[PDB]
Every structure is written in structure tokens, then in C-alpha cells.
């Protein structure tokens, strides 16, 4: 009961910050995928094309976005989930790790000139599974957020 307003401001700030860190992680993972495909385009070009020499710079740019993604994901993990958010957090964890590993595999395939393995990987499915996990998380987070900011949440939900 005591200090309810202050606890509501801190928890609502946390839920927004957690969503923001997941947003950053998703966008950087998509950017990784983009940079990988740009590197693959250079590898498929003939040498005479000015843009073909950039294959390594482009693959390094994918490694950079992927590390940035993982940094934001770490930041997300640094904010303790609220009780009703635990399961959807753990679902993100599972799907994130799968997609992260997929992307690291794609980097390795291009680094070794294995363009066939690169195109064969079912990357889209892994992305879509993480996207679905993000959507479930967002639904849960928004239900909690609406209850907190409208004084319709019992104390147990705020880890009070």
C-alpha cells in the first residue's frame, strides 16, 4: 500500500525501458540480416563492379550490429522481469538465442565462402519465431502497464 505512486512510476518506467531494449535488439538483428545480404550481393558480383570489394567491410558491419544487438539484449536481461512477465521473457530468451545463433552461423558461412549453406538456412522461420515471441511479450507487457497506470493492479504484480 505504502508508496504506491512511487512504485507505479518506477515499474512503469521499467516496462517501457524493457520494451525499448527489445526493440533495439530486434532492429539490430534485422540490420545484421541486411548487412549479411549486402555482403552476399558483393560476393555474387564480378570484380569489375566497384562495389564488389566491400565484402569484408560489409560482413564486419554485420558482426558489429549483431554485437550491438547482444548488448541491448543484455540490457534487457539486466532489468528484472515483473512476475507476470517471466514466462514471456523466457520465451524471448529461447527464440532470441535461436535467431542469434542462426545469424552467427550465417556470418561464418559467408566468412568461409559457403554461399550455398547461407542461402539454405531457414533464417526467416527463426526470425518469425522471435517476432512472435516479441508480440506475445508486448501483449503481456501492455496488459500489466495499463493496469499499473490505471490503479487496477494488485501489489503482488509489481513485485510488491
Ligand X SMILES: N[C@@H](CC(=O)O)C(=O)O
Answer whether 15's CB lies under 8 Å from 145's CB. yes
Give which of 31, 140, 129, 130 is closest to 83, Cα–Cα.
Answer: 140
Residue nearest to ligand X (CB): 123
Nearest to 62 by CA among 122, 107, 98, 24: 107
Q: Does 55 bind ligand X (CB under 6 A)?
A: no
Which of 18, 28, 29, 38 lies at the binding interface for ligand X (CB under 6 A)?
A: 38
Query: Where do contacts with a copy of itself occur on this chain (CB under 8 A)?
Result: 1-5, 8-9, 12-13, 16, 20, 23, 26-27, 30-31, 33-34, 37-38, 40-41, 44-45, 49, 51, 116, 119-120, 124, 127, 131, 138, 142, 145-146, 148-151
Name the DSSP class of 152: -
In the chain, after which residues does the backbone break, taking C–N over 2.5 angstroms as a break?
none
Are 98 and 78 within 8 A, CB to CB? no
Does 104 sit near ligand X (CB under 6 A)? no
Q: Is 124 in the site for ligand X (CB under 6 A)?
A: yes
Partner touching 116 among ligand X, a copy of itself, none, CB below 5 to 8 Å by kind? a copy of itself
Tell whether residue 121 is a contact of ligand X (CB under 6 A): yes
Nearer to a copy of itself, 96 or 145 (CB): 145
Judge contact between 145 and 33, C-beta under 8 A.
no
Is residue 52 involved in binding ligand X (CB under 6 A)? no
Amino acid at each position: 500500500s505504502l508508496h504506491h505512486s512511487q512504485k507505479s512510476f518506477v515499474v512503469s518506467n521499467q516496462l517501457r525501458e524493457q520494451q525499448g531494449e527489445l526493440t533495439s535488439t530486434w532492429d539490430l538483428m534485422l540490420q545484421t540480416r541486411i548487412n549479411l545480404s549486402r555482403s552476399a550481393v558483393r560476393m555474387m558480383m564480378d570484380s569489375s563492379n566497384q562495389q564488389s570489394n566491400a565484402k569484408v567491410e560489409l560482413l564486419d558491419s554485420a558482426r558489429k550490429t549483431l554485437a550491438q544487438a547482444a548488448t541491448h539484449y543484455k540490457k534487457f536481461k539486466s532489468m528484472a522481469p515483473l512476475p507476470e512477465m517471466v514466462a514471456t521473457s523466457r520465451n524471448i530468451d529461447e527464440k532470441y538465442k535461436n535467431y542469434y545463433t542462426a545469424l552467427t552461423e550465417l556470418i561464418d558461412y559467408l566468412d568461409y565462402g559457403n554461399t550455398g549453406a547461407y542461402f539454405a538456412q531457414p533464417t526467416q522461420g527463426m526470425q518469425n519465431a522471435m517476432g512472435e515471441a516479441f508480440a506475445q511479450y508486448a501483449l503481456s507487457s501492455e496488459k500489466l502497464y495499463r493496469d499499473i497506470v490505471t490503479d487496477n493492479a494488485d501489489d503482488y504484480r509489481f513485485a510488491q
